[PDB]
Design a protein around this ligand. Structure first.
Ligand SMILES: CCCCCCCCCCCCC/C=C/[C@@H](O)[C@H](CO[C@@H]1O[C@H](CO)[C@H](O)[C@H](OS(=O)(=O)O)[C@H]1O)NC(=O)CCCCCCCCCCCCCCC
Ligand SMILES: CCCCCCCCCCCCC/C=C/[C@@H](O)[C@H](CO[C@@H]1O[C@H](CO)[C@H](O)[C@H](OS(=O)(=O)O)[C@H]1O)NC(=O)CCCCCCCCCCCCCCC
Ligand SMILES: CCCCCCCCCCCCC/C=C/[C@@H](O)[C@H](CO[C@@H]1O[C@H](CO)[C@H](O)[C@H](OS(=O)(=O)O)[C@H]1O)NC(=O)CCCCCCCCCCCCCCC
Ligand SMILES: CCCCCCCCCCCCC/C=C/[C@@H](O)[C@H](CO[C@@H]1O[C@H](CO)[C@H](O)[C@H](OS(=O)(=O)O)[C@H]1O)NC(=O)CCCCCCCCCCCCCCC
Ligand SMILES: CCCCCCCCCCCCC/C=C/[C@@H](O)[C@H](CO[C@@H]1O[C@H](CO)[C@H](O)[C@H](OS(=O)(=O)O)[C@H]1O)NC(=O)CCCCCCCCCCCCCCC
Ligand SMILES: CCCCCCCCCCCCC/C=C/[C@@H](O)[C@H](CO[C@@H]1O[C@H](CO)[C@H](O)[C@H](OS(=O)(=O)O)[C@H]1O)NC(=O)CCCCCCCCCCCCCCC
Ligand SMILES: *[C@@H]1O[C@H](CO)[C@@H](O[C@@H]2O[C@H](CO)[C@@H](O[C@@H]3O[C@H](CO)[C@@H](O)[C@H](O)[C@H]3NC(C)=O)[C@H](O)[C@H]2NC(C)=O)[C@H](O)[C@H]1NC(C)=O
Ligand SMILES: *[C@@H]1O[C@H](CO)[C@@H](O[C@@H]2O[C@H](CO)[C@@H](O[C@@H]3O[C@H](CO)[C@@H](O)[C@H](O)[C@H]3NC(C)=O)[C@H](O)[C@H]2NC(C)=O)[C@H](O)[C@H]1NC(C)=O
Ligand SMILES: *[C@@H]1O[C@H](CO)[C@@H](O[C@@H]2O[C@H](CO)[C@@H](O)[C@H](O)[C@H]2NC(C)=O)[C@H](O)[C@H]1NC(C)=O
Ligand SMILES: *[C@@H]1O[C@H](CO)[C@@H](O[C@@H]2O[C@H](CO)[C@@H](O)[C@H](O)[C@H]2NC(C)=O)[C@H](O)[C@H]1NC(C)=O
Ligand SMILES: *[C@@H]1O[C@H](CO)[C@@H](O)[C@H](O)[C@H]1NC(C)=O
Ligand SMILES: *[C@@H]1O[C@H](CO)[C@@H](O)[C@H](O)[C@H]1NC(C)=O
Ligand SMILES: *[C@@H]1O[C@H](CO)[C@@H](O)[C@H](O)[C@H]1NC(C)=O
Ligand SMILES: *[C@@H]1O[C@H](CO)[C@@H](O)[C@H](O)[C@H]1NC(C)=O
Ligand SMILES: *[C@@H]1O[C@H](CO)[C@@H](O)[C@H](O)[C@H]1NC(C)=O
Ligand SMILES: *[C@@H]1O[C@H](CO)[C@@H](O)[C@H](O)[C@H]1NC(C)=O
Ligand SMILES: *[C@@H]1O[C@H](CO)[C@@H](O)[C@H](O)[C@H]1NC(C)=O
Ligand SMILES: *[C@@H]1O[C@H](CO)[C@@H](O)[C@H](O)[C@H]1NC(C)=O
Lengths: 590, 136, 590, 136
């Protein structure tokens, strides 16, 4: 009754009206999904034959009872998912036998407290998810000292209203423990005075906790003494939100040492919130889904080393001169902004993708004020007008223009400075290649994605003379009809060549005599009817070839070379080149 | 069939798709006025997968004239706006989602919209609703 | 020796080493270009045979002497061009016989003054150009009262240093005269006190007159009392420029009534100059080639009814709420700006073309704040994201998106509100039509330009059902391979249909049975090899057809209909459909 | 042939085109340094047409590799930046045009650029210069 997914390895038994685990499941199975079956009770020894089982999903199985040896034989189980089962009471030894468990998901099991939760001997446990239960105390139990590998606890969507000094005793005692706490969607209204003195946390998430500004401000103050690597704050659109969100609500954050600060959606927002003085010593600042309209005049003594603005609502490109900023991500912005010059002397990573951005004067040192740029993403944007070939930016390794409207890139050697560039994507930029020198200087280029463009006279010209180290070349959907002589004689290290979905009418045998490294050649979906004799003879490294969806002329002796070649090399052909219906590989001339 | 409501300019109803019947209770308050509406989408169901990367495929047609498939991402997997992006397979989801739209002229006639919810990490189909909207 | 340009009408005799006018020129000639010939002297009666001559160009003819009857017989000459001839002294009666002269160009003839210039009886003269001479006085001679039709005098590039009260006496006496004065490139350093009291001028151009700010400020003050329709001010890049250009330089303009103000290039500029209070009562404001960076906070009591910003350098889209502004032109801006919402309740004309502009949220009433928009040009820009179908803007008659990157226009009826739209251009927008309802609502559309795009499956779909009044349809370069059934059955009034430069493989005879008005059908440059019999039979209005550049199969009886049809209708065929070389029109099957 | 100059990184010379020999004196002060230059283009000639709509067609090649034709408009016909846009056919033109450019990396080698001046209202060719630039 179980859908066999990967034979003797993975089985999908979901929603099969099973009353018990099927004994038909092979003993070598590593992954079993038993969810949405009315199991009701986990009987002893039910899984004792699955000695290699690693992942077991019992979500929504109506389980009320875990028998005292229900998991006998599961020495290798690392993931156990009990979501939605009304177990409520986990009697002592309920998890006996799970000696390799790393991830325990007890979401919505009517669990009432961690103190009574018998996980004190799952010494391998790394992650504990007890979201959506009836937990009302923030007390980290003492047996957490046995769980030396526990790094994450999810307390989201419970009934915790208070955090006391004693609740965090365990972490105060054990400053060496790396622990992350997700407290989201808990109705917290009281944090005891000094509850967070001597407390260290990796990641602390406080999302959707507060209904009132005064309660949030009062609780944030008593985070004092806390040391967090990553603090995540904000609300949800589908929950009752704060009336007003002023910066002074976060006055308490000044008594917290924060390495990384993440702000998410808030109903109310003001641009000053991101300039709040208590965020000055943060090294990674992040905004996601935030109604920020203007990011301007960030004090230069701010120590932000990375800034992340995602799915926000900037009306106008930020003015930033942060001298210690190394990474900048502004992506999926709501609206269209025009690029404005920045002065970021430490900038080495720049992602400006998916902004419908319009960039006038790309690209050189004066646009960015940095000599250390290695990554530049300008994809999924509007008009990018090429006017300078990257003087001052010769450290650039990664360049992506995908789906932006590249303008004037073919009127000079737009990439001549980029002698360390490894990756270039100008796919679907509506570029009409009309200059053989378009790729001069790209001697380090390994990956060239330029699909969806076109060439003058629909002829593939000699643009690859300098790109001697190309290993990946994607020329699909370029409306190509023919290839000039010698276009590939330099690409001795090319491993992939995709020219599918063009309009090639003939091939020449000379273009493929020096593709010594070529492993994959895509020629499907063209207008090809024949190939010259021996065209594939020197492709000594070939492993895959696509030749289908072509109107092949299967008359003898014309189809002789191709049919015999496709037959002898039938393991390499992907799909079926069929005659204008019999595979070309199945044709024997006299 | 599964639910319907009356607007001043719209009659909206849905059933389950013929190929997928995973249950879900959806409604809007108030009924959607295509001229413009501020309201809530009330959702109560038990998902068949995690919602961490929930997105929708919408196949829309007007008077049997089909629009290209559109993809609407609701949960991107990182600091998402909605509390249900955290929900796991088998967990009870009960939420009211505010919405507000205005000022698009819709042609009169008979709309069909099959809405296909996908768990983007596994690409598995969470549910599928077959909507009918009659404008005017 | 003269190049015959239009037989017996237009002759081009330039630079033929002619010593005199050739007697071979036919007597009906209307236009003669004799420039760059060493004529040296215009002898009497030389042109007396050219009774129908209207335009005579003698530029650079080394003429020193005009004989006393040089222009005998030229009763119909309206244009006479003497540029570059060192005549210097124009003796009395030098222009006798030119009884219909409308345009006299005496540029660079070493003319020293107008008082001695014998034009007092050219009562038909409308335009007088005496630029680039030795004129040192601004005195408008008294005989201008005889020249009742003179509306323009070009005094550019002379030696005028002073403008006195008496110099403008003639205009003071004659307030009914409509006269324009071009004073550019004159070294003006003194304007007499009250010289412009009681003076009215249509167009006054003062470009490149001033080397010093103080001299310009002092001279502008004494324009007091002047009433000009159009004042043009500025400098040239290739001339010595003002050290500084502050608004107070134009303090004198407050004592001038100006209907239209044009500012051109200035070396120095400040954004405040456009907000100067002396420009408040102008009705047409214009900036061309000006270094303005920000146009913001224009006082609402400004009466500008049209604003023109051309080839300027705006870093950021203007914020404008001028309630009386009817026309706005922002074009060829240096850089890329993003559109910002404006509030222009009187706006009826909007040209935002050639800005690499990025528009997020096109288009509806809230973007512009007007219900009276009739003209919208957004061509040659960047990303234009369609999100609203023009609610609030149903008065729109003209819509141009040419060469911009239209995004999401095919995901709804993007033009449903535009029931008065006459002209739509979405050519070369990289639009892939995939929605048959893309043009719903366009029932008034007469002109549809959509070349350079493409369609789903390369099939022309039924998108023209509502565009019942189309008269011009351009579908060239759309990569079309075939046409769906019934696509043209609605277009009874279509007069032009351009489907050239596609990839049409066959035609169907049904698509052309209801093109009752079709005059011009372009089908050249496809992949056509045959047509169905009788496909052109019902094209009763056809006057031109293009069928060349197609691989026609000229085998009988297949080519029979086409060859006989092309022969019988050979006056309509443009170019030559030639067989895969003989014209198809020259083939007689048995 | 007609003129030439020496830069620290460029040798620049021009002749008249083989198909059009209408005379014109052009030079730059200083000689153009392709790394960057502030200077003047001195022009003295008598045009064979009005310059109201003067534009240039530039046919450029680098080491015999041809670039697409580029069109550079100098006079648009309305409030133009340069005093010579007013000049008429047969009128003496004598002007110095300031220019300033910087920060484009040019490949080394042998450039050809035929520069074709066109009167845009009549489409007639005013003159044609055959340039040679040797970078490095
Ligand atoms: C004796 C022979 C006569 C020779 C005369 C030749 C003319 C001299 C060149 C004139 C400069 C052109 C304007 C460019 C300005 C750049 O400085 C320009 C600034 O353009 C920026 O790019 C964006 C779009 O334009 C934004 O608009 C920016 O604006 S922003 O503020 O918003 O960001 C703007 O700055 N950078 C460039 O790379 C453009 C190209 C550089 C020109 C190099 C030409 C080399 C000429 C070689 C001479 C050899 C003889 C010629 C034979 C025919
Ligand atoms: C090596 C010696 C040979 C060199 C030949 C010398 C010729 C001089 C070239 C002039 C270039 C500068 C012109 C730009 C003016 C801006 O002003 C202009 C602003 O853009 C337009 O500027 C107009 C002014 O009004 C209108 O505003 C237009 O509006 S439009 O819609 O009507 O079109 C507007 O867009 N910037 C740009 O385009 C982008 C920057 C130019 C890129 C040029 C790169 C280098 C060109 C030199 C070729 C050598 C290649 C060597 C092979 C590797
Ligand atoms: C778990 C299973 C789920 C089952 C039900 C699915 C949920 C249904 C509703 C989800 C999105 C609604 C929230 C809308 C917010 C916008 O209203 C709001 C945008 O609007 C603008 O936002 C601005 C500030 O944000 C201003 O406010 C603007 O105003 S302005 O005048 O100042 O300029 C206002 O226009 N935000 C958004 O993200 C838009 C994206 C929402 C569309 C994506 C999903 C759409 C439907 C999903 C599938 C449809 C099938 C439904 C039944 C199966
Ligand atoms: C019980 C059934 C459940 C029903 C749930 C369905 C979801 C309801 C729709 C949610 C709104 C989507 C976000 C749009 C906001 C606009 O208001 C939006 C604002 O977009 C502006 O456009 C730009 C790009 O986005 C800029 O970004 C602007 O920004 S700006 O400030 O810089 O200029 C931004 O404002 N205008 C629009 O025209 C977009 C389309 C309007 C949506 C109409 C949907 C009608 C739904 C009909 C329901 C029938 C049942 C459904 C069956 C599946
Ligand atoms: C008649 C009843 C049937 C209706 C079906 C109901 C389904 C609900 C439709 C939801 C539409 C609004 C979604 C937009 C969200 C903005 O937010 C969105 C912002 O743009 C993206 O928003 C994402 C949010 O994060 C990412 O930022 C993206 O970044 S990305 O690169 O990853 O892609 C970014 O670009 N605006 C737009 O796209 C343009 C405005 C939407 C145009 C929709 C027009 C009307 C659609 C309804 C179809 C009916 C047609 C009838 C035939 C005439
Ligand atoms: C009558 C016959 C003529 C025969 C000779 C032809 C004239 C030769 C020179 C004409 C243009 C030079 C002036 C350049 C100004 C730019 O320099 C200046 C742009 O540069 C930027 O401008 C900004 C402020 O404007 C900032 O200043 C920028 O700086 S930033 O750092 O602040 O951002 C700066 O980059 N303006 C322009 O219009 C650019 C357009 C000029 C190119 C168009 C013609 C180019 C050559 C023409 C044909 C070549 C053949 C020559 C021999 C036949
Ligand atoms: C701020 O957030 C709180 C949520 O964390 C809201 O308070 C909670 O409101 C729930 C109702 O919306 C209460 O539920 C009910 O619980 C009581 C027991 O206290 C039962 O008798 C009721 O039957 C039950 N509701 C139903 C329908 O049966 C929560 O008990 C309550 N929790 C707390 C800690 O107060 C606040 O209302 C909210 N404020 C605003 C303005 O939205
Ligand atoms: C402001 O603009 C003026 C131009 O209108 C400049 O002044 C003119 O300068 C010319 C030289 O640049 C003078 O030309 C010469 O004229 C004298 C007779 O006055 C002759 O002897 C000289 O031989 C002749 N030059 C040559 C090379 O033969 C103009 O006469 C003169 N005109 C006036 C009215 O002054 C100013 O110099 C200029 N200021 C700046 C700072 O550029
Ligand atoms: C503390 O524990 C967490 C366990 O997840 C560690 O976190 C991750 O670091 C790796 C690499 O730096 C990333 O790929 C993960 O995404 C991180 N996860 C989280 C939740 O942050 C963290 O490095 C540990 N700190 C130590 C061991 O010093
Ligand atoms: C004053 O004389 C000029 C003569 O040119 C008239 O000007 C023109 O008006 C027409 C239509 O309004 C335009 O097409 C021209 O471009 C205008 N030319 C100029 C130079 O402005 C002007 O209308 C006359 N005024 C009258 C007769 O009242
Ligand atoms: C790059 O191309 C140039 C041709 O101008 C050639 O001289 C040079 O050796 C090439 N170098 C590489 C690494 O491709
Ligand atoms: C070739 O390009 C096509 C078109 O995008 C793509 O589907 C295919 O995967 C490519 N072939 C490869 C990568 O081998
Ligand atoms: C949607 O419903 C219509 C009408 O009942 C039906 O014809 C169509 O097949 C359905 N589409 C699905 C279930 O995808
Ligand atoms: C889910 O929420 C809705 C309120 O919109 C209501 O039916 C009830 O509170 C919840 N239903 C349950 C808990 O079954
Ligand atoms: C426009 O198309 C609709 C189809 O939905 C049709 O009912 C209407 O009569 C058409 N009107 C015109 C003028 O094309
Ligand atoms: C058809 O389109 C081509 C391509 O732009 C154009 O050259 C031709 O003039 C058009 N034919 C007409 C307008 O008759
Ligand atoms: C430019 O000069 C070269 C070298 O002398 C010559 O080969 C070429 O034909 C010339 N091009 C013209 C005059 O257009
Ligand atoms: C033209 O100007 C130049 C100065 O650059 C110089 O030769 C002289 O002043 C003028 N030549 C003449 C008037 O022949």
């Amino acid at each position: 009754p179980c859908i066999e997914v990967v034979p003797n390895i993975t089985y999908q038994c979901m929603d099969q009206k099973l009353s018990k685990v099927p004994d038909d499941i092979p003993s070598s199975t590593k992954n079993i999904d038993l969810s949405f079956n009315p199991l009701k009770i986990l009987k002893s020894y039910s899984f004792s034959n699955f000695s290699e089982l690693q992942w077991l999903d019992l979500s929504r199985c109506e389980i009320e009872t875990i028998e005292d040896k229900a998991w006998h034989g599961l020495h290798h189980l690392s993931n156990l998912i009990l979501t939605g089962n009304p177990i409520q009471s986990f009697s002592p030894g309920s998890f006996s036998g799970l000696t390799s468990l790393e991830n325990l998901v007890a979401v919505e099991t009517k669990l009432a407290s961690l103190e009574s939760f018998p996980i004190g001997q799952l010494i391998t446990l790394k992650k504990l998810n007890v979201a959506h239960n009836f937990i009302h105390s923030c007390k980290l139990p003492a047996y957490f000292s046995n769980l030396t590998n526990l790094v994450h606890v999810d307390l989201s969507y419970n009934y915790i209203q208070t955090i006391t000094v004693n609740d965090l005793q365990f972490l105060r005692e054990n400053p060496q423990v790396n622990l992350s706490l997700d407290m989201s969607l808990n109705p917290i209204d009281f944090i005891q005075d000094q509850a967070f003195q001597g407390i260290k946390l990796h990641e602390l998430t406080l999302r959707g906790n507060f209904n009132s500004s005064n309660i949030m401000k009062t609780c944030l103050q008593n985070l004092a003494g806390l040391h967090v690597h990553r603090l995540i704050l904000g609300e949800f659109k589908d929950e009752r939100n704060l009336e007003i969100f002023e910066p002074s609500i976060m006055e308490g954050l000044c008594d917290v040492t924060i390495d990384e600060f993440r702000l998410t959606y808030t109903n109310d927002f003001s641009d000053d919130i991101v300039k709040f003085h208590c965020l000055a010593n943060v090294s990674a600042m992040s905004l996601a889904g935030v109604s920020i309209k203007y990011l301007e005049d960030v004090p230069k003594h701010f120590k932000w080393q990375s800034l992340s603005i995602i799915r926000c609502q900037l009306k106008q490109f930020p003015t930033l001169d942060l001298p210690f900023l190394k990474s900048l991500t502004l992506t999926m912005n709501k609206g269209s902004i025009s690029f404005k010059k920045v002065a970021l002397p430490s900038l080495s990573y720049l992602d400006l993708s998916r902004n419908a951005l319009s960039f006038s004067g790309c690209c050189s040192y004066s646009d960015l004020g940095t000599n250390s740029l290695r990554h530049l993403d300008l994809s999924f944007n509007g008009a990018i007008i090429m006017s300078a070939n990257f003087m001052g930016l010769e450290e650039l390794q990664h360049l992506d223009f995908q789906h932006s409207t590249l303008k004037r890139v073919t009127e000079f050697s737009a990439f001549l400075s980029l002698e360390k560039l490894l990756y270039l994507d100008i796919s679907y930029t509506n570029t009409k290649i009309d200059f053989d020198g378009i790729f001069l200087g790209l001697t380090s280029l390994n990956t060239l994605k330029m699909a969806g463009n076109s060439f003058k006279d629909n002829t593939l010209s000699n643009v690859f003379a300098n790109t001697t180290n190309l290993t990946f070349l994607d020329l699909s959907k370029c409306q190509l009809e023919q290839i000039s002589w010698g276009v590939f004689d330099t690409l001795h290290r090319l491993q992939l060549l995709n020219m599918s979905h063009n309009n090639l009418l003939f091939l020449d045998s000379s273009h493929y005599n020096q593709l010594y490294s070529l492993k994959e050649l895509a020629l499907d979906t063209n207008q090809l009817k024949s190939v010259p004799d021996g065209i594939f003879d020197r492709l000594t490294s070939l492993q895959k070839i696509w030749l289908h969806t072509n109107p092949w002329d299967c008359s003898c002796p014309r189809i002789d070379y191709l049919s015999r070649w496709l037959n002898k090399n039938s393991q390499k052909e992907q799909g079926s080149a069929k005659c204008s219906g019999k595979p070309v590989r199945s044709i024997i001339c006299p | 069939q599964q639910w319907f409501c009356n607007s001043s300019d719209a009659i909206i109803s849905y059933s389950y798709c013929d190929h997928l019947k995973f249950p879900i209770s959806i409604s809007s308050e108030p009924c959607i006025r295509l001229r413009g509406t501020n309201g809530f989408v009330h959702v109560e169901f038990i998902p068949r997968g995690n919602l961490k990367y929930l997105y929708f495929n919408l196949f829309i047609s007007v008077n049997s004239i089909e629009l290209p498939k559109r993809k609407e991402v609701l949960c991107h997997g990182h600091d998402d706006d909605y509390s249900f992006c955290r929900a796991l397979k088998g967990e009870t989801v009960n939420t009211s989602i505010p919405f507000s739209f205005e000022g698009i002229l819709f042609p009169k006639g008979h709309y069909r919209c099959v809405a296909e919810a996908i768990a983007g990490d596994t690409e598995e189909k969470l549910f599928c609703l077959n909507f009918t909207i009659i404008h005017r």
